[PDB]
């Protein structure tokens, strides 16, 4: 469960991301395909080369859904209902992959926001991304 302090931490951290969210989503994805090549099995239809437009475009979508989550932190299941449906019934991504993308988002944030990525903030973001993952795999079976 996210505490009041976690919520504050995540809001602050995400706030500084601001207009770079798109670029960071893309970066996290690239970091994921390279570090954990098994995740590429879910995107055989994408050109996955460095800087490709599918990845760029997909990064924005991911980052935007996260912005939405932060804004609806107190009501995530409802705000993410449609994406939960998507991941569970159509895409059917194995749950173990959520942890991998989450770590890569954390590394991306650590690389771009040195001042803001304090230890307490690091802890809150990890909890937040986990909470997001639980919701997204909530309707799998």
């Amino acid at each position: 469960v996210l505490s009041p302090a976690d919520k504050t931490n995540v809001k602050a951290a995400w706030g500084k991301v601001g207009a770079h969210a798109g670029e960071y989503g893309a970066e996290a994805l690239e970091r994921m395909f390279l570090s954990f090549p098994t995740t590429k099995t879910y995107f055989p239809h994408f050109d996955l080369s460095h800087g490709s437009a599918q990845v760029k475009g997909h990064g924005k979508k991911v980052a935007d859904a996260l912005t939405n989550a932060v804004a609806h932190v107190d009501d995530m299941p409802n705000a993410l209902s449609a994406l939960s449906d998507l991941h569970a019934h159509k895409l059917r991504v194995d749950p173990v992959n959520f942890k991998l993308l989450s770590h890569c988002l954390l590394v991306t944030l650590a690389a771009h926001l040195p001042a803001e990525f304090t230890p307490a903030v690091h802890a809150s973001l990890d909890k937040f991304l986990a909470s997001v993952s639980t919701v997204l795999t909530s309707k799998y079976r």
């Binding site: 090549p37 098994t38 099995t41 879910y42 055989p44 569970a88 895409l91 059917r92 991504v93 194995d94 173990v96 992959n97 799998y140 079976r141």
Partner: protein, 146 residues
Amino acid sequence: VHLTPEEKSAVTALWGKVNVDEVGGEALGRLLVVYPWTQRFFESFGDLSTPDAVMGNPKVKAHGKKVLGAFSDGLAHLDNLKGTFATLSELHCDKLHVDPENFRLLGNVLVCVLAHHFGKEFTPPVQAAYQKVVAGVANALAHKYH
């Protein structure tokens, strides 16, 4: 796969009793029922909407035998799992696009099926040997991914 000789003899001992045809079908079927997201790879198999639909699907049953035939062939080459499964690895990666975590889930379901079929004969020590084997087979199948 670091397997003691007594581990290895326990595995082969039990395996000689397995009806591979029937066990392959039960294991693949149960995979699709317990972990329904794995159904994403078999839409051409037809009706998979309920347990009986999955478990009695002739296409599931025939595919199950194909999987276990390959697994058996693996138990005959325990010291070279990676070479034995290389072409199957490439294929599952480059053509079929199957996340290797699926190989781990199947292994655990196969372990449940063996226990289901053999009862007390599936002793803790025998389970422990089979757990090493299914992990080794899963690692071998994942090894050519890139």
